[PDB]
Amino acid sequence: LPGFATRAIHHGYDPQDHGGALVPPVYQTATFTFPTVEYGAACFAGEQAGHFYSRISNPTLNLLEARMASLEGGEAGLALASGMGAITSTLWTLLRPGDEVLLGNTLYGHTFAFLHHGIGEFGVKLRHVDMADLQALEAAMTPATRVIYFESPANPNMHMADIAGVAKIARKHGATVVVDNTYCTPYLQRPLELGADLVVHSATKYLSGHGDITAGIVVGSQALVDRIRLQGLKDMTGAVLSPHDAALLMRGIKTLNLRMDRHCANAQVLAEFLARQPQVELIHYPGLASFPQYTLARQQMSQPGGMIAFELKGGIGAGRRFMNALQLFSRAVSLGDAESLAQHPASMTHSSYTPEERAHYGISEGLVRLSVGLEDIDDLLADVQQALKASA
Amino acid sequence: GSNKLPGFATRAIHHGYDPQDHGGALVPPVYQTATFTFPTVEYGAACFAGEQAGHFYSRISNPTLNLLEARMASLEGGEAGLALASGMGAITSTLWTLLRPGDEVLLGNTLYGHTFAFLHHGIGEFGVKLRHVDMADLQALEAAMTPATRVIYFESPANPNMHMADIAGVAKIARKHGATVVVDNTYCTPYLQRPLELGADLVVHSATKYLSGHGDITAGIVVGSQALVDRIRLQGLKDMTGAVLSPHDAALLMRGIKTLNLRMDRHCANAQVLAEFLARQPQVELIHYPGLASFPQYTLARQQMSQPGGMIAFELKGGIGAGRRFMNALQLFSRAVSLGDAESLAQHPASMTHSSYTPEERAHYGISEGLVRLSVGLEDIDDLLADVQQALKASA
Numbered sequence: 039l040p041g042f043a044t045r046a047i048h049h050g051y052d053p054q055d056h057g058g059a060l061v062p063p064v065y066q067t068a069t070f071t072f073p074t075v076e077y078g079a080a081c082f083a084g085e086q087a088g089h090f091y092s093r094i095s096n097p098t099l100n101l102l103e104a105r106m107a108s109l110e111g112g113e114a115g116l117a118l119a120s121g122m123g124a125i126t127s128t129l130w131t132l133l134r135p136g137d138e139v140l141l142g143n144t145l146y147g148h149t150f151a152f153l154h155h156g157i158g159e160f161g162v163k164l165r166h167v168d169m170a171d172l173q174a175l176e177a178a179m180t181p182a183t184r185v186i187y188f189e190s191p192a193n194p195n196m197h198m199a200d201i202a203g204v205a206k207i208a209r210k211h212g213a214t215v216v217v218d219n220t221y222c223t224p225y226l227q228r229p230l231e232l233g234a235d236l237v238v239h240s241a242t243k244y245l246s247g248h249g250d251i252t253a254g255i256v257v258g259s260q261a262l263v264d265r266i267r268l269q270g271l272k273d274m275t276g277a278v279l280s281p282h283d284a285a286l287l288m289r290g291i292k293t294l295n296l297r298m299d300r301h302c303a304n305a306q307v308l309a310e311f312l313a314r315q316p317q318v319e320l321i322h323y324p325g326l327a328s329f330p331q332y333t334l335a336r337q338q339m340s341q342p343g344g345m346i347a348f349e350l351k352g353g354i355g356a357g358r359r360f361m362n363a364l365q366l367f368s369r370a371v372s373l374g375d376a377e378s379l380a381q382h383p384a385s386m387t388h389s390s391y392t393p394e395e396r397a398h399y400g401i402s403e404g405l406v407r408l409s410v411g412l413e414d415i416d417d418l419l420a421d422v423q424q425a426l427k428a429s430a
Numbered sequence: 431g432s433n434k435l436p437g438f439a440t441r442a443i444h445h446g447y448d449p450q451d452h453g454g455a456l457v458p459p460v461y462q463t464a465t466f467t468f469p470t471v472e473y474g475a476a477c478f479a480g481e482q483a484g485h486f487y488s489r490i491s492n493p494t495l496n497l498l499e500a501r502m503a504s505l506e507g508g509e510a511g512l513a514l515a516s517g518m519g520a521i522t523s524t525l526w527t528l529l530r531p532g533d534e535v536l537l538g539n540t541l542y543g544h545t546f547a548f549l550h551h552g553i554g555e556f557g558v559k560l561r562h563v564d565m566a567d568l569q570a571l572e573a574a575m576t577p578a579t580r581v582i583y584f585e586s587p588a589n590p591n592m593h594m595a596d597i598a599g600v601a602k603i604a605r606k607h608g609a610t611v612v613v614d615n616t617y618c619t620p621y622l623q624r625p626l627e628l629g630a631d632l633v634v635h636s637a638t639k640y641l642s643g644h645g646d647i648t649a650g651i652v653v654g655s656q657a658l659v660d661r662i663r664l665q666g667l668k669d670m671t672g673a674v675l676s677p678h679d680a681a682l683l684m685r686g687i688k689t690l691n692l693r694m695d696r697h698c699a700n701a702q703v704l705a706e707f708l709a710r711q712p713q714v715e716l717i718h719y720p721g722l723a724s725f726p727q728y729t730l731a732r733q734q735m736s737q738p739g740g741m742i743a744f745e746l747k748g749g750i751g752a753g754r755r756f757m758n759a760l761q762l763f764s765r766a767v768s769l770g771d772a773e774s775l776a777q778h779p780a781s782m783t784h785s786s787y788t789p790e791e792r793a794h795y796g797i798s799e800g801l802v803r804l805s806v807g808l809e810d811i812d813d814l815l816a817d818v819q820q821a822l823k824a825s826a
């Protein structure tokens with residue numbers, strides 16, 4: 039069993055099989071041909087485990103899937119046009135009218151919109167529960183419960199979930215547990231190893247690393263991934279990942295270990311710094327001693343990650359002033375790029391709302407979120423420091 | 431004077447782009463970027479509130495895609511466009527946005543297989559009622575409308591029989607009962623047929639086929655009113671499918687569109703010469719091509735398509751086994767699903783797509799044991815003729 043860096047570079051590919059090419063060639067093709075109608079016939083039931091149309095089985099995409107499956111330690115992988123691609127295809131195939139999905143207390147905005155305004159409107163029952171509270175979770179189960187879905191750590195406050203805890207509970211009811219592992223990557227956390235059934239990824243973020251691609255991943259067990267490929271992707275979503283973008287995702291995956299180390303090192307520093315700031319009410323970073331779920335965090339993540347959330351003392355106004363003053367962080371939604379990013383939802387995403395609605399969603403008035411990039415930590419410090427000056 | 435619409439080719443190469451707004455770049459740069467940033471936190475406050483113009487995240491809107499979208503809209507004759515990861519991405523994003531439990535969809539009698547799967551085993555398992563109807567029969571369609579009918583959805587010409595519908599007839603009926611008409615316009619492209627100009631509310635495309643023209647990308651387009659395209663963009667795509675089109679692929683789609691009028695003229699000139707030849711060969715029992723008077727809906731084709739297309743279907747004498755022997759003798763056509771490539775493609779559903787079924791359930795689906803489908807490409811006609819004639823001789 040080769041190491042993670044090795045596998046992330048080499049897994050699933052032998053140059054000697056493809057003309058000696060160091061880097062595998064990109065199958066930017068829509069369709070595939072057949073030597074005979076017989077060899078055609080085989081590929082519409084599926085006996086010679088291989089290549090089928092490119093909206094089902096392109097080699098380039100297969101290489102990506104196998105590598106990601108290796109990295110998350112799962113049976114099988116599926117690549118998709120976007121992270122929503124991955125989550126919609128999974129849920130559309132796993133759920134039907136009357137089934138229930140249990141959801142983590144908070145969710146990526148578009149996931150929430152999919153659940154409450156998408157499948158939810160098609161007769162699927164939604165319940166939100168705190169997924170670190172195993173008793174609340176147990177009590178929430180009903181015969182109807184078929185899926186339990188959550189992120190860990192979860193936007194907005196890095197609130198973790200006890201993956202193995204929930205998974206014990208799901209076994210008692212044959213429920214499928216699905217974990218959005220976008221924030222951690224298989225490099226920092228492997229939820230399948232902790233007993234989840236499927237993981238989903240917005241590969242758009244850390245896995246790509248360079249913010250030039252939109253892509254999605256699903257990893258899990260061959261049977262589940264099979265159904266999602268042939269039902270979710272093929273029939274319900276059509277979220278097909280382009281071969282060019284697959285290749286670039288692979289190119290990005292080759293540095294995962296190296297980039298995530300830096301992202302973390304950079305975040306650790308920025309966070310001990312913020313933790314001492316008198317403009318700072320409160321801070322959420324898994325790697326501080328003050329992080330309420332510190333122990334659970336260290337149990338599931340091998341490093342505390344590249345994301346920080348803090349609340350500024352002066353609410354919306356401070357938030358605004360802080361955001362405007364940054365010259366190195368860019369005001370943008372998104373995360374996991376080489377570039378450092380910030381957002382202040384109160385005055386950005388959730389601006390149109392009001393204080394009382396933002397409290398409902400746990401979006402504090404002065405809540406800012408940092409995606410710490412790979413720039414030099416002294417440059418990142420100077421920027422955060424001056425931006426704090428302006429926030430007075 | 432200057433209130434005249436530019437020609438189709440002109441709009442295909444230029445619409446929506448002036449080099450002078452991107453520093454003289456003759457070809458638009460490609461926005462291969464996932465995210466966009468904001469100068470002020472206020473500037474971006476408005477981009478989540480309808481006040482200002484710009485882009486937030488390439489899953490919702492992007493300048494490479496926007497141009498592609500605007501060009502397609504101009505070609506189709508519609509208000510707005512939307513570009514997605516595939517034909518199915520376009521179709522599913524649209525129906526997921528437009529339908530809810532208790533709504534009914536009227537469907538054409540036959541469809542593309544994944545569209546059929548999506549409908550029967552996907553959206554239909556979610557509380558949406560389905561009914562099929564001969565769209566060529568306006569009397570039957572009128573009869574089928576009920577106050578639950580929300581959409582009428584069909585392809586014209588349809589897979590795989592090229593059955594056609596009267597678009598303007600359907601729209602007329604739909605305007606009377608109040609349903610949204612969506613037409614899958616893949617086979618024609620906007621160069622041969624414009625359903626929106628005929629009264630349809632939305633067209634969808636597998637741009638993967640003719641629009642791309644070069645079989646290297648998978649991509650979907652939807653075109654219609656600003657108010658429905660936005661709904662679809664903001665609900666279907668953003669929330670329910672995530673069928674995001676890659677800007678690299680959209681740049682290639684745009685590159686392919688630049689020669690559409692030329693590719694199409696040649697697909698059609700080729701198929702016409704092929705069809706006429708096939709109609710006259712001993713091994714050919716039957717032939718379906720819209721440019722032939724023997725085509726059952728000859729009159730609707732002439733009326734609705736400016737040209738008869740690159741698809742031919744034809745039945746062989748000798749039974750499945752002639753088919754096999756034909757398909758396998760081919761040296762220039764390739765054995766393959768798909769259409770609208772530069773390369774000529776053939777398929778023999780009997781010994782291929784529908785090969786697991788026994789000779790019974792194939793005759794049950796209108797599908798002969800001698801049926802073969804041709805997507806005629808852009809090769810030299812004699813070469814194509816020569817290959818097919820050598821191949822008929824083999825299936826003797």
Ligand SMILES: N[C@@H](CCS)C(=O)O
Nearest residue numbers: 146193371372373487
């Ligand atoms: N995940 C980021 C951006 C994706 S659109 C966010 O939370 O806004």
Ligand SMILES: N[C@@H](CCS)C(=O)O
Nearest residue numbers: 542589590767768769
């Ligand atoms: N539309 C073509 C190819 C897509 S798989 C077909 O009818 O099979």
